[PDB]
C-alpha atoms as a printed R data frame, in Angstrom:
   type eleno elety resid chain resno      x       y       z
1  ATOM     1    CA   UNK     A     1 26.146 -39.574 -19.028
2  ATOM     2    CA   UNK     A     2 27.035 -37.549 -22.377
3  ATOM     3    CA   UNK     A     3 29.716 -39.849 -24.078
4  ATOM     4    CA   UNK     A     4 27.457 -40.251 -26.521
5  ATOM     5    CA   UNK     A     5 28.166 -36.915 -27.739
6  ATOM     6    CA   UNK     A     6 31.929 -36.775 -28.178
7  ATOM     7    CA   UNK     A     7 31.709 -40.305 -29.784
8  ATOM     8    CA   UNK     A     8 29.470 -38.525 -31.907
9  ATOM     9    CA   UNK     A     9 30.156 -34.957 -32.513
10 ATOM    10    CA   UNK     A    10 27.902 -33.074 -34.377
11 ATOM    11    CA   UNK     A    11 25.277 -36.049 -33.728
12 ATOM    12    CA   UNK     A    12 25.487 -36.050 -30.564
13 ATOM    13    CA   UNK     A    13 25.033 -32.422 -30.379
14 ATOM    14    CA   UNK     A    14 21.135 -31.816 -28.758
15 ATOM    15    CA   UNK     A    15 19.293 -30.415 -25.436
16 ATOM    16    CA   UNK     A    16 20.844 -33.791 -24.501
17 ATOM    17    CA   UNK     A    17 24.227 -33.483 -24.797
18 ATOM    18    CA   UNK     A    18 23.550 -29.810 -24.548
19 ATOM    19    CA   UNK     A    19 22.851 -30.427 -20.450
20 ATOM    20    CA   UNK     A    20 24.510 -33.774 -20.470
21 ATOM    21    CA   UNK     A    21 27.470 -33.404 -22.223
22 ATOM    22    CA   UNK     A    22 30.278 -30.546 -22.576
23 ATOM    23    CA   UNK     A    23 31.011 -31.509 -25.709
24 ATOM    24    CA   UNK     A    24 29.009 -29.820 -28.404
């Protein structure tokens, strides 16, 4: 999981996307 983040950017930056996405 972690799309969320790139589709998001600086929203989806977070603990979440911090360990479930390499994105932010």
């Amino acid at each position: 999981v972690g799309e969320r983040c790139c589709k998001n950017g600086k929203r989806g930056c977070g603990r979440w996307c911090r360990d479930h996405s390499r994105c932010c």
